[PDB]
């Protein structure tokens, strides 16, 4: 139905909903590849949960469309660009602005975490801004989505546990990345410098980083707790939400969403 | 300046001309402060000196070292040929025999370095280089020890990196260097990375598993060598000796020969920087 524009399995073409004349980005994918997948059921569940998710900081997926060969996911279009574009214009950002933004991210992540969903590839590409300027997080519950001369990063955030190549607590992983994002906003670089990869990994494993001088002591403390390499000893979302630095000028959003709509919808999600 | 007329600027590498002989070189220029006050000043010294003394047709040469009260200057052979992988872009895969040539050169070079007691620690395409003649030459050998080598723009692939390295702890350098050669060889032949770059956490999963799917066009013996090289276990990973003995590796191969003096008085090595 959508008046689609343009544009290996994730050609996110632009489009518009003709009937309400609104244009929303569509992530398109081979129907086959997904439906056969170890995570297929989780994909369905995660897709369905989010589909019903409604939060000021989370980019929404309006609808899922089905084809014989392809699946179309309909996702809100955020013009405000990437937040880190804003950083690049300025280098680092201010404590206050940064805290406003970090709070938003944490709240959105908490919301997603509450519904049993984890990101697992939380990075700045995902960080986005709505026209009014609010943070919308993206690719949430989309990570499970199946899978030359130039390859661009960055695996800097990738939590140590992931480095192991085994199993990781999703929440612990997401928070770790959240720690890094916070770090980049304030400091205007990555806590662990990319150029030397083996050394980068050693640094990540040791959690040894160069703090900037301008970071206040608390922020540093919060970051150390966020950037614990050990998932068991690392801070909880709850823990950080109750932080002294985090707490400042804080205010809790509260959403009003449907209790998870009939799974029947979930089973019928793809056909 | 100190025999050299410097240009600008490719850590900061710069183009330079050796005036006295009137020949041309690239120079790495860095602060004295950063190098001397590093956990690894001693290792840096040893390896640097070894390189200065090394001489091999496939290894980018370290002519000499210049020291200032404020900074350290490293002179290196200049190669016009550029990245080998540019060649891959043109024709996708390289052919089996040619790929074998290059692999022979790379293995020879690494082996020579390894014998001399030095390990690369960061073998990636940037380092693989070509000369006017079309021969391969390998850079940043003995410079991984170099401090903090070298924002949004990042051009690093972790695919080559060995798994043990992934941990962030300890490994024998050689096994890691062998792993990269394994990846390097694979990419040449196949015209892609063994493990998909995207979905990085799954990417790391693949690497630690050492799960990769060879193309059909790969011959059985090459597959064997790749499999043996791409052992996620570094105690069960093939040594340079093994790979040199390997069948597919044996084919048409001829040991390179070069002459360098026994490592010049370390006293020189300690006096390298002052």
Secondary structure of chain A in HEC code, one letter for each residue: CCEECCCCCCEEECEEEHHHCECCCEEEEEHHHHHCCCCHHHHHHHHHHHHCCCCCCECCEEEEEECCCEEEEEECCCCCCCHHHHHHHHCCCCHHHHHHHHHHHHHHHHHHHHCCCCCCCCCCCCEEECCCCCEEECCCCCCCCCCCCCCCCCCCCCCHHHHHCCCCCHHHHHHHHHHHHHHHHHHCCCCCCCCCHHHHHHHHHHCCCCCCCCCCHHHHHHHHHHCCCCCCCCCCHHHHHCCHHHHCCCCCCCCCCCCCCCHHHHHHCCC
The first and second tokens of residue A5, run together, are 């524009």
Q: For chain A, what's the residue count?
A: 271
Using the Cβ of A205 and the Cβ atoms of chain B, whether some distance falls under 8 Å is answered with yes
Q: How far apart are CA B131 and CA A205, in angstroms?
A: 38
Distances (CA, A) of A251 to A24, A103, A181, A225, B110: 30, 9, 21, 22, 59
CATH superfamily of the domain spanning B79-257: Transferase(Phosphotransferase) domain 1 (1.10.510.10)
Q: Coil, strand or helix: which one is B234? A: coil
CB B18 within 8 A of CB B4: yes
**SS in 3 state form for B223-250?**
HHHHHHHCCCCCCCCCCHHHHHHCHHHH
Cα dihedral across residues B73, B77, B80, B85: positive or negative: negative
CB A13 within 8 A of CB A5: yes
Residue B117 region, left (φ>0) first, then alpha (ψ -120 to 50), else beta? Answer: left
Q: How far apart are CA B26 and CA A68, in angstroms?
A: 58
A197, A202, A204, A229: best to mutate for the B interface, most B CBs within 10 A: A197
**SS in 3 state form for A7-18?**
CCCCEEECEEEH
Classified by CATH at the fold level, domain B1-78 comes out as Phosphorylase Kinase; domain 1 (3.30.200)
**For residue B265, how many other CB atoms are within 10 A of its CB?**
10
> How near does any CA of chain A get to the CA of B21, in Å?
34
**For residue B100, how many other CB atoms are within 10 A of its CB?**
20
Q: Which of B176, B189, B181, B112 is nearest to B144 (CA)?
A: B176
Which residues of chain A neighbour B157 with C-beta distances below 8 Å? 151
What is the helix (H) or strand (E) element at residue B108, kind and residue range? helix B96-115
Cα dihedral across residues A234, A237, A243, A245: positive or negative: positive
Q: How far apart are CA A108 and CA A137, in angstroms?
A: 7
Q: Please, which experimental method was used?
A: X-ray
Using the Cβ of B40 and the Cβ atoms of chain A, whether some distance falls under 8 Å is answered with no
Phi, psi angle pair for A150, to nearest 5° = -110, 125
Q: Coil, strand or helix: which one is B190? A: helix
Q: How far apart are CA A85 and CA A79, in angstroms?
A: 12
Q: How far apart are CA A173 and CA A113, in angstroms?
A: 12
Helix then strand count (H, E) for chain B reads 11, 8
**Which among A166, A195, A205 has CB closest to B150?**
A195
Bridge-partner residues for B66, per DSSP? B73
Q: How far apart are CA B272 and CA B49, in angstroms?
A: 7
Q: Which of B94, B76, B60 is nearest to B27 (CA)?
A: B76
Binding-site entries of A for ATP: 8-12, 27
Contact A196 B158 (CB under 8 A): no
The resolution, in angstroms to one decimal, equals: 3.3
Q: Which of B255, B185, B176 is nearest to B223 (CA)?
A: B185
Angle at A24 between CA A19 and CA A29, to 5 degrees: 110
Place of tokens 């994909």: A43
CATH superfamily of the domain spanning A78-254: Transferase(Phosphotransferase) domain 1 (1.10.510.10)
Known active-site residue B122:
yes
Which residues of chain B neighbour A195 with C-beta distances below 8 Å? 148-150, 156
> How near does any CA of chain B get to the CA of A218, in Å?
24
Place of tokens 């823990």: A239
Q: How far apart are CA B187 and CA B191, in angstroms?
A: 5
Q: What is the dihedral of CA B91, B92, B95, B96, to 10 degrees?
A: 160
Which residues of chain A neighbour B148 with C-beta distances below 8 Å? 193, 195-196, 199
Distances (CA, A) of A241 to A94, A102, A178: 20, 11, 13
Cα dihedral across residues A192, A196, A197, A198: positive or negative: negative
Residue A43 region, left (φ>0) first, then alpha (ψ -120 to 50), else beta? Answer: alpha
* Cβ contacts of A94 within 8 Å, gap of 6 or more: none
Cα dihedral across residues A103, A49, A38, A168: positive or negative: positive
Q: How far apart are CA A154 and CA A140, in angstroms?
A: 18
Q: DSSP for chain B, please give it.
A: -TTEEE-----EEEEEEETTTTEEEEEEEEEHHHHHTSTTHHHHHHHHHHHHH---TTB-----EEE-SSEEEEEEE--SSEETHHHHHHHSSPPHHHHHHHHHHHHHHHHHHHHTT---S---TTTEEE-TTS-EEE--TT-TTSTT---------SSSS-HHHHHTS---HHHHHHHHHHHHHHHHHHSS-SS-SSSHHHHHHHHHHT-----TTS-HHHHHHHHHHS-S-TTTSPPHHHHHH-HHHHTT---------S---HHHHHHTT-
The first and second tokens of residue A209, run together, are 């980083």
Domain boundaries, chain A: 1-77, 78-254
> How near does any CA of chain B get to the CA of A118, in Å?
13
Q: How far apart are CA B154 and CA A193, in angstroms?
A: 10
The one-character DSSP state at B59 is B
Q: Which of B35, B11, B19 is nearest to B150 (CA)?
A: B11
* Cβ contacts of A12 within 8 Å, gap of 6 or more: A25, A26, A27, A28
Exposed, middle or buried by CB within 10 Å (0-12, 13-18, 19+), for A7? Answer: exposed
Contact B168 A121 (CB under 8 A): no
* Closest chain A residue to B90, measured at CA: A149
Contact A201 B150 (CB under 8 A): no
Q: For chain B, what's the residue count?
A: 274
Q: How far apart are CA A246 and CA A102, in angstroms?
A: 8
Using the Cβ of B170 and the Cβ atoms of chain A, whether some distance falls under 8 Å is answered with no
* Cβ contacts of A198 within 8 Å, gap of 6 or more: B121, B122, B144, B161, B165, B176
| HSE toward the beta carbon, residue B274, CA cutoff 13 A | 8
Which residues of chain B neighbour A201 with C-beta distances below 8 Å? 161, 165-168
**Which among B149, B192, B208 has CB closest to A164?**
B208
The first and second tokens of residue A197, run together, are 């990869």
Strands A70-75 and A26-30 come out as antiparallel
Q: How far apart are CA B65 and CA B50, in angstroms?
A: 12
Asked if residue B28 belongs to a known ligand binding site, the reply is: yes
Residue B245 region, left (φ>0) first, then alpha (ψ -120 to 50), else beta? Answer: alpha
Using the Cβ of A18 and the Cβ atoms of chain B, whether some distance falls under 8 Å is answered with no
* Cβ contacts of A228 within 8 Å, gap of 6 or more: A207, A234, A235
Distance of CA B39 to the CA centre of its chain: 22
Q: Which of A206, A238, A245, A190 is nearest to A222 (CA)?
A: A245
CB A134 within 8 A of CB A104: yes
Contact A154 B154 (CB under 8 A): yes
Distance of CA A58 to the CA centre of its chain: 9
Distance of CA A3 to the CA centre of its chain: 28
**For residue B26, how many other CB atoms are within 10 A of its CB?**
18
**For residue B272, how many other CB atoms are within 10 A of its CB?**
17
Bridge-partner residues for B128, per DSSP? B138
Tell me the CATH class for A1-77.
Answer: alpha beta
The first and second tokens of residue B52, run together, are 């200065």
Place of tokens 């040594």: B239
**Which among B165, B193, B197 has CB closest to A198?**
B165
Q: Which of A128, A106, A227 is nearest to A172 (CA)?
A: A227
């Amino acid at each position: 139905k959508y008046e689609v524009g343009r544009t290996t399995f994730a050609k996110v073409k632009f489009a518009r909903n003709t009937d309400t004349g609104d244009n929303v980005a569509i992530k398109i994918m081979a129907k086959s590849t997904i439906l056969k997948n170890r995570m297929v059921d989780q994909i369905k569940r995660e897709i369905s949960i989010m589909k019903i998710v409604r939060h000021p900081n989370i980019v929404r997926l309006y609808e899922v469309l089905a084809s014989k060969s392809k699946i179309y996911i309909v996702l809100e279009f955020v013009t405000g660009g990437e937040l880190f574009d804003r950083i690049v214009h300025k280098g680092r950002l201010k404590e206050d602005e940064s805290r406003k933004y970090f709070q938003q991210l944490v709240d959105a992540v908490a919301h997603c975490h509450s519904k049993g969903v984890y990101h697992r590839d939380l990075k700045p590409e995902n960080l986005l801004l709505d026209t009014n300027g609010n943070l919308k997080v993206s690719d949430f519950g989309l990570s499970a989505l199946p899978q030359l001369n130039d390859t661009c990063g960055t695996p800097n955030y990738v939590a140590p546990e992931v480095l192991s190549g085994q199993g990781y607590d999703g929440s612990a992983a997401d928070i770790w990345s959240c720690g890094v994002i916070l770090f980049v906003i304030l400091a205007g670089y990555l806590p662990f410098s990319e150029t030397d990869l083996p050394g980068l990994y050693r640094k990540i494993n040791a959690a040894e980083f160069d703090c900037p001088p301008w970071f206040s002591a608390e922020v540093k403390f919060l970051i150390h707790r966020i950037l614990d390499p050990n998932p068991k000893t690392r801070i909880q979302i709850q823990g950080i939400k109750k932080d002294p630095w985090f707490r400042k000028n804080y205010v809790p959003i509260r959403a009003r969403e449907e209790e998870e709509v009939n799974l029947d919808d979930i089973r019928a999600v793809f056909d």
